[PDB]
């Protein structure tokens, strides 16, 4: 019988306009409306499953921040990540007696800086990613980009570590990984290719791991509120409505990528698990 | 030998984040980055062509602003329009001794509040609009929305006044209206359905009227910088690159929807015309 762990991998801050587009627009009375710098959790999910350990997302690389960090200067100042050492993925896994080598499957929701940071560690896993997301990230790597949400140094390491990739084709959906574990293909929206996960736990029932397909309850609505910069705005909305439909049809809880208040109510890996 | 006039129809102000998404994002050094209320012009173009007069866009309705205005309260405070009576479209057309009934074709780039405000004056003209733009605005009407970029009161009057609509089908493109005058179908992007115009003038050469498909030189780039909220982001980028391609292949100049510095340099209808 599977156990599912929520691992706390620190906090990030950014302009709220990135999370909720035009959340507070200028008006005649407030022509110089100040934005704000919200904080939100970064997290990862481990499913300790009889058929093999599954990891959903991988958080940020420990070498992300600082003068010698992988993230570019402007990226560090716009999306600072604060994490104590216990928050690093390898530490969180170690405290559960789980070594990187023990992971059979890693689902990369997408290849942004806060979800793909530690892919390089899982050299024995099959790494599951959307084919267009994989293609889009590799192109940014070939153009040698120092700034942005795709980290050159992270991608460099994935290639050097020769990860065993399995790309999800753009017309593939509902891919059964193990009993009660199903990959959901949301396609393009927030990024080129978003994957989610549906988990059926014997006791707790259905869970949908949405990652950045839905940032928060405010994004989810109604009304649906899209992020400030969006790759495929139509796809984004269509993906949110697909999540809602699946949630309703399967009586599933939806776990957002970065909701401070939802995350607060999760039992974390320091305290236990869901079964 | 056709003449082309540029009619100044006033100025509008709004949060710059509407024009250029995430122009000045929050940082650690500046967590409450203030936005800015920017000013830009609203304008329309009349082509005096021997085969018939042609109007491109129609600015805002004189009854838009104020306590009794058609624009919702929030809309007025986020997108205030300023204009003296001489800026009104019926007054610009009068100063040129052209009567609304003379106009053979009115091109509605799209049906937003600052481009479709005076469609109701043109009861004899053929009103050309993208079929999905028409559908979309009509839905907002049926839903009685009092706020937003589609104006319930304006749509009301279009229906009351029984306009002669010609919808451009979503697969139609390069529709010849008269010698040297061609409708360009950009499709979804900024709105559900964008139309531009290509104008071949004997002396001045090629002119592309982009309207809201490209706000300004900063939007055009490169790099292309999208608006802050955007209906169809992929569509938006596709249309800009189509505008670039056509401008290159025809050696045409691109007239943006709302570029202050470009507009400053145009020859207004008070001073003369292009030929
Ligand atoms: Co992301
Ligand atoms: Co994220
Ligand atoms: Co406009």
Say whether domain A1-275 belongs to CATH 3.60.15.10.
yes
By the 10 Å C-beta count (0-12 exposed, 13-18 middle, 19+ buried), A144 is classed as exposed
User: What are the φ/ψ torsions at residue A57 (nearest 5 degrees)?
Assistant: 65, 165
Chain A residues with CB-CB distance to B25 below 8 A? 14-15, 17-18, 35, 78
Distance A110 CA to ligand 2 centre (A): 9
Gyration radius (Cα) of chain A, Å: 18
H-type alpha helices, A103-232: 131-142, 152-160, 217-220
Q: Which two tokens stand for residue B152?
A: 């319930």
Distance from C-alpha of A39 to C-alpha of A82, rounded to nearest angstrom: 10
Buried b (16+ CB within 10 A) or exposed e, B127-138: bbbbbbbbebbe
Closest CA to B82 of A136, A28, A256, A162: A28
Q: Secondary structure of A228-275 in the HEC alphabet? A: CCCCCHHHHHHHHHHHHHHHHHHCEEEEECCCHHHHHCCCECCCCCEC
Tell me the domain boundaries of chain B. 1-275
Q: How many helices (H) and strands (E) does chain A have?
A: 8, 12
* Cα–Cα separations (whole angstroms), residue A162 to A71, B107, B211, B271: 22, 56, 49, 68
CA dihedral A154, A160, A164, A166 (to 10 degrees): 50
Distance A260 CA to ligand 1 centre (A): 16
Q: How was this structure determined?
A: X-ray
Distance A40 CA to ligand 2 centre (A): 10
Sign of the alpha-carbon dihedral angle for B137, B139, B142, B144: negative
Cβ atoms of A112 and A212 closer than 8 Å:
yes
SS3 assignment, position A6: strand
DSSP run (H or E) holding A76: helix A73-78
Residue A35 to residue B37, Cβ atoms within 8 A: no
Kindly report the nearest CA distance between residue B228 and chain A, in angstroms: 6
Chain B residues with CB-CB distance to A234 below 8 A? 188, 231-235
Residue A230 to residue B230, Cβ atoms within 8 A: yes
Kindly report the nearest CA distance between residue A275 and chain B, in angstroms: 40
List the single best residue of B16, B22, B143, B145 to mutate versus A (max A Cβ within 10 A): B22
Q: Where are the extended beta strands (E) located within A101-227?
A: 103-107, 126-130, 164-168, 175-178, 181-187, 194-201, 205-211
Residue A35 to residue B32, Cβ atoms within 8 A: yes
A:B CB pairs within 8 Å: 105
Residue B234 to residue A234, Cβ atoms within 8 A: yes
CA atoms within 13 A on the CB side of A53: 18
Give yes or no for A13 touching B (CB within 8 A). Answer: yes
Give yes or no for B33 touching A (CB within 8 A). Answer: yes
CA atoms within 13 A on the CB side of A131: 7
């Amino acid at each position: 019988q599977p156990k599912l762990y929520v691992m706390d991998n620190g906090r990030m801050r950014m302009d709220k306009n990135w999370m909720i587009a035009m959340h507070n627009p200028a008006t005649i009375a407030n022509p110089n409306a100040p934005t704000e710098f919200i904080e939100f959790p970064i997290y990862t999910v481990l499913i300790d499953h009889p058929e093999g350990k599954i990891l959903f997302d991988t958080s940020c690389n420990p070498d992300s921040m600082g003068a010698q960090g992988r993230w570019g200067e402007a990226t560090q100042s716009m999306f600072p990540w604060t994490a104590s050492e216990e928050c690093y993925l390898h530490n969180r896994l170690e405290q559960l007696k789980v070594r990187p080598e023990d992971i059979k499957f890693v689902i990369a929701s997408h290849l942004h800086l806060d979800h793909a940071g530690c892919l390089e560690m899982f050299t024995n896993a099959t790494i599951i990613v959307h084919e267009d997301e994989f293609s889009g990230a590799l192109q940014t790597y070939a153009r040698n980009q120092t700034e942005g949400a795709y980290i050159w140094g992270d991608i460099d390491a994935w290639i050097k570590n020769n990860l065993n990739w399995r790309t999800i084709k753009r017309d593939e959906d509902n891919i059964v990984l193990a009993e009660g574990i199903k990959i959901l293909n949301f396609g393009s929206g927030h990024a080129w290719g978003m994957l989610g996960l549906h988990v059926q736990l014997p006791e707790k029932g259905g869970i949908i791991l949405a990652s950045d397909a839905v940032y928060s309850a405010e994004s989810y609505g109604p009304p649906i509120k899209p992020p400030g910069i969006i790759y495929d705005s139509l796809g984004f909305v269509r993906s949110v409505e697909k999540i809602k439909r699946i949630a309703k049809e399967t009586n599933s809880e939806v776990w957002f990528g970065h909701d401070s208040e939802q995350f607060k109510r999760f039992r974390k890996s320091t305290e236990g698990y869901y079964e």
